[PDB]
Write an enzyme that holds these catalytic residues in place. Structure first.
Site, PDB file in Angstrom:
ATOM      1  CG  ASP A  10       4.578  -1.827   6.487  1.00 49.02           C
ATOM      2  OD1 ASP A  10       3.435  -2.273   6.264  1.00 49.02           O
ATOM      3  OD2 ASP A  10       4.940  -1.422   7.599  1.00 49.02           O
ATOM      4  CB  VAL A  11       5.367   1.024   0.432  1.00 48.45           C
ATOM      5  CG1 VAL A  11       5.035   2.304   1.211  1.00 48.45           C
ATOM      6  CG2 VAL A  11       5.933   1.327  -0.952  1.00 48.45           C
ATOM      7  CB  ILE A  26      -1.984   5.654   1.333  1.00 47.23           C
ATOM      8  CG1 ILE A  26      -2.602   4.287   1.023  1.00 47.23           C
ATOM      9  CG2 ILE A  26      -3.079   6.686   1.606  1.00 47.23           C
ATOM     10  CD1 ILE A  26      -3.462   4.262  -0.213  1.00 47.23           C
ATOM     11  CD  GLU A  37       3.115  -4.672  15.071  1.00 42.91           C
ATOM     12  OE1 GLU A  37       3.369  -4.033  16.128  1.00 42.91           O
ATOM     13  OE2 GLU A  37       3.836  -4.625  14.046  1.00 42.91           O
ATOM     14  CG  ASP A  94      15.238   0.815  11.826  1.00 41.54           C
ATOM     15  OD1 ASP A  94      16.355   1.301  11.519  1.00 41.54           O
ATOM     16  OD2 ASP A  94      14.228   1.502  12.039  1.00 41.54           O
ATOM     17  CB  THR A 153       3.728  -3.530  22.520  1.00 42.51           C
ATOM     18  OG1 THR A 153       4.170  -3.874  21.196  1.00 42.51           O
ATOM     19  CG2 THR A 153       4.861  -2.864  23.291  1.00 42.51           C
ATOM     20  CG  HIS A 163       8.589  -5.974  16.156  1.00 45.34           C
ATOM     21  ND1 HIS A 163       7.494  -5.162  15.937  1.00 45.34           N
ATOM     22  CD2 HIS A 163       9.627  -5.148  16.428  1.00 45.34           C
ATOM     23  CE1 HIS A 163       7.858  -3.897  16.085  1.00 45.34           C
ATOM     24  NE2 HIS A 163       9.143  -3.866  16.388  1.00 45.34           N
ATOM     25  CG  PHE A 194      -2.006  -1.020   1.125  1.00 46.37           C
ATOM     26  CD1 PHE A 194      -1.690  -2.377   1.210  1.00 46.37           C
ATOM     27  CD2 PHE A 194      -3.334  -0.644   0.921  1.00 46.37           C
ATOM     28  CE1 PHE A 194      -2.678  -3.351   1.107  1.00 46.37           C
ATOM     29  CE2 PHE A 194      -4.331  -1.619   0.812  1.00 46.37           C
ATOM     30  CZ  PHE A 194      -3.995  -2.969   0.915  1.00 46.37           C
TER      31      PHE A 194
END
Length: 275
Positions: free
Chosen positions: A141-142, A62, A233, A256, A175, A163, A60
């Site tokens: 995710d983009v 956007i 999530e 990351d 979480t 994660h 996606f």
């Protein structure tokens, strides 16, 4: 029906020597956890090519996120399912802003104009299309880039990805949604892993089941005036708690580097956040 593999020469697997001793490579429900060193990609490539496997990749983009598409798609061309049939599905509010990226043979891209959007879009409106066009769906995710191989080792009826912030955490620290009033609620004494919403997938059937369940659960929450702490999530985590994934991807598949560096446990950084 599955035809025979051809003769192949490769190192013999050794029963009394693990591929990786530093990490868990199988879940307690006997699903592989995919790390570098656990798979022979030549064997897997053979197995999946013999089935003429097509992989759909949904993304996606956007509003301002359309800016991420160029690097996302160019790096996917370098690293994602190379050698296999791939169909990109780019959901966007700005079809004109999708970059013209050069694709390898056997790969195609469709632009589909459009909290609950993603789960509803995958399940509700695209159901027949995917079933007719691809064998597996991968939902990512983009705002990411591929840096290394992401291939058929991930394919399975249902997968989630660890994660990167929580793979070493105790479940009490996860979480998850902790309010019993939410459909996503998970008590402190439950939970296997914390999966990231940025990379999940499986067979078209299993992915539609998952997205349908999450969309329904999110609608219930909306009606009850509650929004899960981490949105879809949180729901993804509830679903994968109650419907165990048949493979789990290591954080090689969702990293990351700016935030988290490059720990020894990661031999490859495959799919990473753009800083």
């Amino acid at each position: 029906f599955m035809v025979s593999l051809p003769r192949m020469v490769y190192p013999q697997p050794k029963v009394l020597t693990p591929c990786r001793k530093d990490v868990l490579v199988v879940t307690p429900w006997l699903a592989p956890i995919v790390w570098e060193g656990t798979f022979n990609i030549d064997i897997l490539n053979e197995q999946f090519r013999l089935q003429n496997t097509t992989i759909g990749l949904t993304v996606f983009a956007i509003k301002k996120y359309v800016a991420f598409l160029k690097l996302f798609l160019e790096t996917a061309e370098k690293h994602f399912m190379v050698g296999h049939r791939v169909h990109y599905y780019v959901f966007t509010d700005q079809p004109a802003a999708v970059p013209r990226v050069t694709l390898g043979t056997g790969r195609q891209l469709s632009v589909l104009e459009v909290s609950m959007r993603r789960m509803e879009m995958i399940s509700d409106f695209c159901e027949r299309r995917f079933l007719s066009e691809v064998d597996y769906l991968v939902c990512v995710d983009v705002d990411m880039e591929f840096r290394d191989h992401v291939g058929v080792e991930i394919l399975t009826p249902l997968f989630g990805t660890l994660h990167p912030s929580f793979y070493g955490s105790s479940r009490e620290a996860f979480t998850y949604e902790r309010r019993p009033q939410s459909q996503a609620y998970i008590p402190k004494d439950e939970g296997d892993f914390y999966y990231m919403g940025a990379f999940f997938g499986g067979s078209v059937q299993e992915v539609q089941r998952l997205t349908r369940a999450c969309h329904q659960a999110m609608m219930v929450d909306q009606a009850n005036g509650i929004e899960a702490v981490w949105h879809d999530e949180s729901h993804l985590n509830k679903y994968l708690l109650r419907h165990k994934p048949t493979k789990v991807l290591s954080p090689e598949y969702l990293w990351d580097q700016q935030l988290l560096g490059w720990p020894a446990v990661l031999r490859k950084l495959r799919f990473t956040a753009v800083p």
